[PDB]
Design a protein around this ligand. Structure first.
Ligand SMILES: O=P(O)(O)O[C@H]1[C@H](OP(=O)(O)O)[C@@H](OP(=O)(O)O)[C@H](OP(=O)(O)O)[C@H](OP(=O)(O)O)[C@H]1OP(=O)(O)O
Ligand SMILES: O=P(O)(O)O[C@H]1[C@H](OP(=O)(O)O)[C@@H](OP(=O)(O)O)[C@H](OP(=O)(O)O)[C@H](OP(=O)(O)O)[C@H]1OP(=O)(O)O
Ligand SMILES: [Ca+2]
Lengths: 387, 388
């Protein structure tokens, strides 16, 4: 009956979490205005984020079955499914909710490293090369990417929405402007690429608004009611997307930082394939998706009906399709995600009312008219990035 | 909780949440009407995805309550082994435990225990006759007929026949069984089987269970009972068949005492006799019949659940609570039925302390409560030991 979906690996970020807005946090320091309250402490998933993942899980399960992988109504064979999350509350949580929605009533544990509350090396996008040539070249690549962006409109808008000149940052630390302030990038050995300055603050702020919107806060409680149009979202989102792009998206940085994740995905889909599950779920972070995508050299992609480049509840679904011979196998990779509205509305997902799907393309594995490329070339892409 | 009251242990005896109509009633449903039954997203008897979300909300609600009461701290996981979750080995009950525990302790490592051999009944949750003596039966068969005789179901059956066009069903056109009221019931109490009824009472229960479930699942109005049920009173009259079935089978003391013994024994260990070594929080997930027979077996006072047509609601829990009154140096028991209203299920309403689940305080005949719903622990232990 032709090509059947034989193996999938799903790379996920955590779903909806509470912004961190307690005394002394970046959010609190960045405005004199009070933030609306959330149901859990900062950085913890919300219940709506779990329900959104349950819906994604159920949709995915339907879809997996539709493509021949394991049929609806029965648990998959033991050890058919392997769920591995970074060792943080929100990523373990998003895995539990996804796996429960997709595989209800089945014994599929979520795995994670022993120490909760700390970064697992698999998911920790840290710089591994201590040479000053790597650092100089990384810094120059971040600065170059940043220098292409026109952010002052975004910043002026944000200063007005937050009353930034009256915030604790301004009054106590004399950091009083977003639009005129200087970014400082870092590419420190054994840390994440970073930036300090307005871009980091604009990132934290716009992220908080995005989350309020998705969480379903009334319009008057999103950003104090100040974001009234998609156009405004678009202007503001330039900061959050520009932060991620600057840091995680240069070729120098990404290939280094995402090595343990690339290696994990190579092992699962290529080099230790005999033992691999039919379904792997990894749950990490936006920086992991951003650097992975750069490190495997995907072509440019655009996500319709989303303001985020790496959306809350958005997953990279790598798919190995098999008919009769392993050397005729095909690979197809899609970004499967909920639109900004499907998130805010908690939309019930189904085959008739699906998640959004965009097919992604590796530069090294050109796809046909239907998004498939030969496994032969996929394998070469992975080997080469995993070197 | 009053001043100086501190909650210290809870046991949550839950029904599964929202499931598709039982596959075992499929052919009765088919014989009872010429109409087409709306299709469900899962095989009969399995939890639906909505059941899952609804149970995630009950978990988060119970979490917020437990943190209000100082039983668990906001923003961290409970101590290892302090939460013990044990489900019957069926898809729906294990699924409901997983969704409850994920909604309540998201991000925490809290396993759902069940016997292996999923798809088979775990004896703890198996509401079966466990006495093969012919003298058990006669007291039982009679106690069931006695409960059944207190109910007036004729109007329910005429309503059901009207709504289903039962006149044109296979049952009537082919088998010439052309009235549910004129037909008779025959109870059974067969060794290692659930107490049972043959006849129009089982037909009524099967159909009206399906309608109730359609309504919860959010089928559109024209697809719950083919749009035939217009009035909350019509719901109430139909629900008599389903509540009547359960009450006849699981609610006479002589049946309920036998059939609930394993769960009664379990709850007695956890709350009374092995209490010291017992998890602070226990979730058991079983079946409506478990709740029904448990509550008779412990001699509860009669209760009414507001905003529900079911006597043991979908997702509904019996919540046993040991409290220390520090001021008067006493240990008290409070027991409440906590559950979603028919509208909270159909709407998938988010639940929190600000928009809470329904709660009704229950009362042991052996353990009379004060003005606030609390009774003494020693009186509770007697009831429990005596019952076990
Ligand atoms: O640890 P990372 O892999 O870098 O990613 C997460 C987080 O991603 P999710 O939002 O996917 O969980 C980021 O979120 P953005 O602000 O970039 O949207 C970021 O920021 P926060 O500190 O605001 O969470 C933060 O990066 P870093 O690890 O450098 O702090 C980090 O959170 P954790 O520190 O908890 O991992
Ligand atoms: O067999 P149980 O252990 O009681 O559990 C369920 C179900 O209960 P829940 O909806 O609470 O989980 C019952 O049916 P309802 O009381 O819910 O209508 C039940 O018995 P009935 O069909 O007599 O009601 C049926 O067991 P069986 O069909 O063998 O009698 C069974 O479900 P399964 O059909 O999935 O075993
Ligand atoms: Ca600029």
């Amino acid at each position: 009956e032709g090509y059947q979906l034989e193996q999938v690996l799903i790379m996920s970020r955590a779903n909806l979490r509470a912004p961190l807005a307690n005394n002394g946090s970046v959010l609190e320091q960045s405005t004199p205005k009070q933030w609306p309250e959330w149901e859990v402490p900062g950085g913890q998933l919300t219940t709506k984020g779990g329900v959104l993942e349950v819906y994604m899980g159920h949709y995915m399960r339907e879809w997996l079955a539709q493509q021949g992988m394991v049929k609806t109504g029965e648990c998959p064979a033991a050890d058919s499914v392997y769920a591995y999350a970074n060792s943080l509350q929100r990523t373990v949580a998003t895995a539990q909710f996804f796996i429960t929605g997709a595989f209800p009533g089945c014994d599929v544990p979520v795995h994670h490293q022993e120490k909760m509350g700390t970064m697992d090396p698999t998911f920790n996008p840290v710089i591994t090369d201590n040479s000053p040539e790597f650092r100089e070249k990384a810094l120059k690549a971040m600065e170059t990417e940043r220098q292409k962006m026109q952010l002052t409109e975004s910043y002026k808008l944000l200063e007005q929405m937050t009353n930034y000149a009256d915030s604790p940052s301004c009054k106590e630390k004399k950091v009083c402007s977003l639009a005129d302030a200087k970014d400082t990038f870092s590419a420190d050995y054994e840390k994440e690429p970073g930036v300090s300055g307005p871009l980091k603050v604009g990132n934290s702020l716009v992220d908080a608004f995005t989350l309020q919107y998705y969480e379903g806060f009334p319009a008057d409680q999103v950003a104090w009611g100040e974001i009234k149009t998609d156009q405004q979202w678009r202007v503001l989102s330039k900061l959050k997307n520009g932060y991620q792009d600057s840091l995680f998206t240069s070729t120098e940085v990404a290939q280094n930082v995402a090595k343990p994740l690339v290696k994990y995905i190579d092992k699962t889909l290529v080099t230790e394939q005999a033992k691999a599950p039919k379904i792997t779920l990894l749950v990490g972070h936006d920086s992991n998706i951003a650097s992975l995508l750069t490190a495997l050299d995907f072509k440019p992609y655009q996500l319709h009906d989303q303001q985020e480049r790496t959306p809350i509840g958005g997953k990279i679904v790598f798919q190995r399709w098999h008919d009769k011979n392993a050397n005729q196998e095909l690979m197809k990779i899609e970004y499967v995600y909920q639109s900004s509205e499907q998130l805010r509305n908690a939309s019930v997902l189904s085959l008739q009312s699906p998640a959004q799907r965009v097919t992604l393309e590796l530069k090294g594995c050109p796809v046909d008219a239907n998004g498939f490329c030969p496994v032969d070339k996929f394998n070469a892409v992975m080997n080469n990035a995993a070197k």
